[PDB]
Design a protein around this ligand. Structure first.
Ligand SMILES: Cc1ccc(N2C(=O)CCC2=O)cc1
Ligand SMILES: [Cl-]
Ligand SMILES: [Cl-]
Ligand SMILES: [Cl-]
Ligand SMILES: [Cl-]
Ligand SMILES: [Cl-]
Ligand SMILES: [Mg+2]
Length: 342
């Protein structure tokens, strides 16, 4: 066990191992400080979780986040550098701290002057990370430019996995502009195909400099979507589980899919083709991440011997019914068993 030291930073007590120095608040589910890690030489973000075990729902969320971060080991996905608690036993266990690489710019802070070569490299990396994530049957659910970190060499990492309230999704808000229509309107049980819709929205915005579907509310956004991709046919309508939602869709006048070369004027014809394969209303028919990596748009970067998949991931806890102290004890076991990366 390392030696810990205590300090108050912005009305919060932080108790951390001596290796972490020069803590500086940078953000406020928890508070975040930047620090220098003297063991690795990296600048890091240290997150102190807020009330991690306040309810069954909160305690399960804490366990879910730690399990996910401990599993992710890929160049294009955020990984866990350290996790610690100052408690010396389960009996006194109350606080959880998570340590990651400190990220600078996100994709918004780049969306600069982008060549087609830049768009190829950025979207390639998102898809490489998503192939890995999806191979473990994980769905990110919240892909958008602010959840993508990018450095000076155009290297990218996915962060902030979906672990959002009704209020946060209301109105003219970027928190909804990248969501697939079937999850935005609760059409049906969703799966990993929702993330590919989000990639299509991000790629379009890199090519044009503008948000693809900046709706002022849920219904305005649906109308923007259906104008581009067309109204649904009977085949997709049968897959929408709510009679009310089916009824609403049928109230709209029918529209054909638009010509994407006349929307994305001047774009690489291979980029236009890939967008048509991502932005498909019926999620059963969207291209997958593994299939998209082999698309000719990425010919300069695709290497099928360097696009790895994940170790198997056990999510059986998600259907388990436990008490607060049982989720807390499971979380404690995961804290003390952590083994740092090389
Ligand atoms: C409204 C709008 C704005 C930009 C673009 N565009 C592309 O899609 C590739 C290069 C370019 O300028 C197309 C439409
Ligand atoms: Cl230490
Ligand atoms: Cl990382
Ligand atoms: Cl504690
Ligand atoms: Cl964003
Ligand atoms: Cl596992
Ligand atoms: Mg975020």
């Amino acid at each position: 066990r390392p030696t810990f030291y205590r300090q108050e930073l912005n009305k919060t007590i932080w108790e951390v191992p001596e290796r972490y120095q020069n803590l500086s608040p940078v953000g406020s589910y928890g508070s975040v400080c930047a620090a220098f890690d003297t063991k690795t030489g990296h600048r890091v973000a240290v997150k102190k979780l807020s009330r991690p075990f306040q309810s069954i729902i909160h305690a399960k969320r804490t366990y879910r986040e730690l399990r996910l971060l401990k599993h992710m080991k890929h160049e294009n996905v955020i990984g866990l550098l350290d996790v610690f608690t100052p408690a010396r036993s389960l009996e006194e266990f109350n606080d959880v701290y998570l340590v990651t690489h400190l990220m600078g710019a996100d994709l918004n802070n780049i969306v600069q002057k982008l060549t087609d070569d830049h768009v190829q490299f950025l979207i390639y990396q998102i898809l490489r990370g998503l192939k890995y994530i999806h191979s473990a049957d994980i769905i990110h659910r919240d892909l958008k430019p602010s959840n993508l970190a990018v450095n000076e060499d155009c290297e990218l990492k996915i962060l902030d996995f979906g672990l959002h309230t009704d209020d946060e999704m209301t109105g003219y808000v970027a928190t909804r502009w990248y969501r697939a229509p079937e999850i935005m309107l609760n059409w049906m049980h969703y799966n990993q195909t929702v993330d590919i819709w989000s990639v299509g929205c991000i790629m379009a915005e890199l090519l044009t400099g503008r948000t693809l579907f900046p709706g002022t509310d849920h219904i305005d956004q649906l109308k923007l979507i259906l104008r581009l991709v067309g109204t649904p046919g009977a085949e997709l309508l049968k897959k929408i589980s709510s009679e009310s939602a089916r009824n609403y869709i049928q109230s709209l006048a029918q529209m054909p899919k638009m010509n994407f070369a006349n929307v994305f004027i001047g774009a690489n014809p291979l980029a236009v083709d890939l967008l048509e394969k991502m932005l498909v209303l019926d999620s059963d028919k969207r291209i997958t991440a593994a299939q998209a990596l082999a698309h000719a748009y990425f010919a300069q970067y695709h290497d099928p011997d360097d696009e790895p998949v994940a170790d198997p991931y056990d999510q059986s806890f998600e259907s388990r019914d436990l008490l607060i102290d049982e989720w807390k004890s499971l979380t404690y076991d995961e804290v003390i068993s952590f083994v740092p990366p090389p």
